[PDB]
Design an enzyme around this catalytic site. Sequence first.
Site, PDB file in Angstrom:
ATOM      1  N   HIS A  69       0.795  -1.233   0.000  1.00 17.87           N
ATOM      2  CA  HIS A  69       0.000   0.000   0.000  1.00 17.87           C
ATOM      3  C   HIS A  69       0.834   1.294   0.000  1.00 17.87           C
ATOM      4  O   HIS A  69       0.316   2.368   0.298  1.00 17.87           O
ATOM      5  CB  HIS A  69      -0.973  -0.035   1.171  1.00 17.87           C
ATOM      6  N   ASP A  76      -0.809  -8.435   5.140  1.00 20.78           N
ATOM      7  CA  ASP A  76      -0.682  -9.886   5.012  1.00 20.78           C
ATOM      8  C   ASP A  76      -2.019 -10.636   4.958  1.00 20.78           C
ATOM      9  O   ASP A  76      -2.062 -11.830   5.256  1.00 20.78           O
ATOM     10  CB  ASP A  76       0.140 -10.415   6.198  1.00 20.78           C
ATOM     11  N   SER A  79      -6.123 -11.265   9.648  1.00 24.22           N
ATOM     12  CA  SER A  79      -5.296 -11.546  10.827  1.00 24.22           C
ATOM     13  C   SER A  79      -3.792 -11.320  10.537  1.00 24.22           C
ATOM     14  O   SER A  79      -3.442 -10.704   9.520  1.00 24.22           O
ATOM     15  CB  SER A  79      -5.615 -12.948  11.377  1.00 24.22           C
ATOM     16  N   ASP A  95       2.052   8.921  10.279  1.00 21.77           N
ATOM     17  CA  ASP A  95       0.981   8.263   9.512  1.00 21.77           C
ATOM     18  C   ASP A  95       0.644   6.888  10.085  1.00 21.77           C
ATOM     19  O   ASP A  95       1.510   6.182  10.610  1.00 21.77           O
ATOM     20  CB  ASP A  95       1.363   8.147   8.032  1.00 21.77           C
ATOM     21  N   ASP A  99      -4.978  -2.405   8.154  1.00 26.33           N
ATOM     22  CA  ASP A  99      -5.181  -3.460   7.178  1.00 26.33           C
ATOM     23  C   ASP A  99      -6.673  -3.674   6.888  1.00 26.33           C
ATOM     24  O   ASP A  99      -7.425  -4.113   7.770  1.00 26.33           O
ATOM     25  CB  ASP A  99      -4.556  -4.742   7.732  1.00 26.33           C
ATOM     26  N   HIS A 119      -3.425   2.272  20.160  1.00 22.57           N
ATOM     27  CA  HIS A 119      -2.086   1.716  20.130  1.00 22.57           C
ATOM     28  C   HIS A 119      -1.251   2.386  19.059  1.00 22.57           C
ATOM     29  O   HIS A 119      -0.150   2.856  19.324  1.00 22.57           O
ATOM     30  CB  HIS A 119      -2.135   0.203  19.834  1.00 22.57           C
ATOM     31  N   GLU A 120      -1.779   2.438  17.842  1.00 22.59           N
ATOM     32  CA  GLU A 120      -0.998   2.953  16.712  1.00 22.59           C
ATOM     33  C   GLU A 120      -0.643   4.423  16.858  1.00 22.59           C
ATOM     34  O   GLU A 120       0.460   4.833  16.484  1.00 22.59           O
ATOM     35  CB  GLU A 120      -1.729   2.756  15.384  1.00 22.59           C
ATOM     36  N   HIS A 123       2.383   5.209  18.630  1.00 22.34           N
ATOM     37  CA  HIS A 123       3.559   5.203  17.751  1.00 22.34           C
ATOM     38  C   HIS A 123       3.684   6.517  17.006  1.00 22.34           C
ATOM     39  O   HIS A 123       4.777   7.055  16.889  1.00 22.34           O
ATOM     40  CB  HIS A 123       3.521   4.075  16.709  1.00 22.34           C
TER      41      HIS A 123
HETATM   42  O1  LIG Z   1       2.820  -3.674  16.517  1.00 20.80           O
HETATM   43  C1  LIG Z   1       2.075  -3.518  15.567  1.00 20.80           C
HETATM   44  C2  LIG Z   1       1.179  -4.598  15.076  1.00 20.80           C
HETATM   45  C3  LIG Z   1       0.248  -5.008  16.200  1.00 20.80           C
HETATM   46  C4  LIG Z   1      -0.840  -3.965  16.396  1.00 20.80           C
HETATM   47  C5  LIG Z   1      -1.428  -3.872  17.779  1.00 20.80           C
HETATM   48  C6  LIG Z   1      -2.695  -3.354  17.921  1.00 20.80           C
HETATM   49  C7  LIG Z   1      -3.271  -3.231  19.165  1.00 20.80           C
HETATM   50  C8  LIG Z   1      -2.602  -3.620  20.310  1.00 20.80           C
HETATM   51  C9  LIG Z   1      -3.204  -3.488  21.628  1.00 20.80           C
HETATM   52  C10 LIG Z   1      -2.506  -3.903  22.753  1.00 20.80           C
HETATM   53  C11 LIG Z   1      -3.021  -3.825  24.034  1.00 20.80           C
HETATM   54  C12 LIG Z   1      -4.286  -3.317  24.159  1.00 20.80           C
HETATM   55  C13 LIG Z   1      -4.993  -2.899  23.069  1.00 20.80           C
HETATM   56  C14 LIG Z   1      -4.478  -2.973  21.793  1.00 20.80           C
HETATM   57  O2  LIG Z   1      -6.233  -2.416  23.408  1.00 20.80           O
HETATM   58  C15 LIG Z   1      -6.210  -2.611  24.843  1.00 20.80           C
HETATM   59  O3  LIG Z   1      -4.970  -3.160  25.336  1.00 20.80           O
HETATM   60  C16 LIG Z   1      -1.336  -4.144  20.165  1.00 20.80           C
HETATM   61  C17 LIG Z   1      -0.753  -4.265  18.924  1.00 20.80           C
HETATM   62  C18 LIG Z   1      -0.372  -6.291  15.747  1.00 20.80           C
HETATM   63  O4  LIG Z   1      -0.945  -6.386  14.669  1.00 20.80           O
HETATM   64  N1  LIG Z   1      -0.218  -7.302  16.663  1.00 20.80           N
HETATM   65  C19 LIG Z   1      -0.365  -8.680  16.227  1.00 20.80           C
HETATM   66  C20 LIG Z   1       0.550  -9.677  16.854  1.00 20.80           C
HETATM   67  C21 LIG Z   1       1.871  -9.514  17.220  1.00 20.80           C
HETATM   68  C22 LIG Z   1       2.522 -10.598  17.778  1.00 20.80           C
HETATM   69  C23 LIG Z   1       1.870 -11.804  17.966  1.00 20.80           C
HETATM   70  C24 LIG Z   1       0.545 -11.952  17.598  1.00 20.80           C
HETATM   71  C25 LIG Z   1      -0.095 -10.869  17.036  1.00 20.80           C
HETATM   72  C26 LIG Z   1      -1.501 -10.811  16.568  1.00 20.80           C
HETATM   73  C27 LIG Z   1      -1.704  -9.312  16.556  1.00 20.80           C
HETATM   74  O5  LIG Z   1      -2.014  -8.999  17.897  1.00 20.80           O
HETATM   75  N2  LIG Z   1       1.947  -2.362  14.834  1.00 20.80           N
HETATM   76  O6  LIG Z   1       2.082  -1.224  15.665  1.00 20.80           O
HETATM   77 CA   LIG Z   2      -3.629  -8.636   8.437  1.00 23.14          CA
HETATM   78 CA   LIG Z   3       2.430  13.061   7.566  1.00 21.32          CA
HETATM   79 ZN   LIG Z   4       1.793   1.083   5.662  1.00 19.45          ZN
HETATM   80 ZN   LIG Z   5       2.754  -1.361  17.790  1.00 18.79          ZN
END
Ligand SMILES: O=C(C[C@@H](Cc1ccc(-c2ccc3c(c2)OCO3)cc1)C(=O)N[C@H]1c2ccccc2C[C@H]1O)NO
Ligand SMILES: [Ca+2]
Ligand SMILES: [Ca+2]
Ligand SMILES: [Zn+2]
Ligand SMILES: [Zn+2]
Length: 161
Positions: A69, A76, A79, A95, A99, A119-120, A123
């Site tokens: 994108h 991916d 999930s 930014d 997904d 969460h994002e 970052h």
């Molecule tokens: O790090 C990332 C990707 C991450 C994205 C991601 C999104 C939300 C939360 C999160 C954590 C705690 C929380 C909450 C949300 O709401 C309440 O408490 C954690 C990570 C992802 O997609 N995590 C995946 C992951 C990573 C490692 C093992 C399994 C999985 C399945 C997904 O959870 N981008 O910034």
């Molecule tokens: Ca995905």
């Molecule tokens: Ca920007």
């Molecule tokens: Zn991207």
């Molecule tokens: Zn993250």
Amino acid sequence: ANVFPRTLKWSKMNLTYRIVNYTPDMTHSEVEKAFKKAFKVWSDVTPLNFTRLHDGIADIMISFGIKEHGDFYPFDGPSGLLAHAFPPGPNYGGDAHFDDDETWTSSSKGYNLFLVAAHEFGHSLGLDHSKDPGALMFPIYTYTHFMLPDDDVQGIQSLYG
Ligand SMILES: O=C(C[C@@H](Cc1ccc(-c2ccc3c(c2)OCO3)cc1)C(=O)N[C@H]1c2ccccc2C[C@H]1O)NO
Ligand SMILES: [Ca+2]
Ligand SMILES: [Ca+2]
Ligand SMILES: [Zn+2]
Ligand SMILES: [Zn+2]
């Protein structure tokens, strides 16, 4: 003369965002509500303010996409990776990409957009992942009356006071 700052953070407190496009899984209104509530998580514990722009270049550009994108972090399918965001800076900095092969909801079904956005946007503001399993910034999604945990409050306040 000017030097680049050490820690990655926004040098201004009044930041803008733009919802560039929308997932099919929720109404425009629901998507707008989710992202607005997610910014409020951070604005309630910092001096940061977030204003929405309807077009043009915003500090935080928000978009949905699938597979490749326009960056080096292709999605991916259903999930796996849910979303990612770039740390503060010019150009792509701040930014947040989500997904659109996920099922996004305002509920406990699929993946909760507000929670993932919160969460994002951590970052987008300069927080890396936490080692604290209870933290919003822990790298694994878990669903939960949401209250920002102490580890995230400490983290974000070390950046913005
Ligand atoms: O790090 C990332 C990707 C991450 C994205 C991601 C999104 C939300 C939360 C999160 C954590 C705690 C929380 C909450 C949300 O709401 C309440 O408490 C954690 C990570 C992802 O997609 N995590 C995946 C992951 C990573 C490692 C093992 C399994 C999985 C399945 C997904 O959870 N981008 O910034
Ligand atoms: Ca995905
Ligand atoms: Ca920007
Ligand atoms: Zn991207
Ligand atoms: Zn993250």
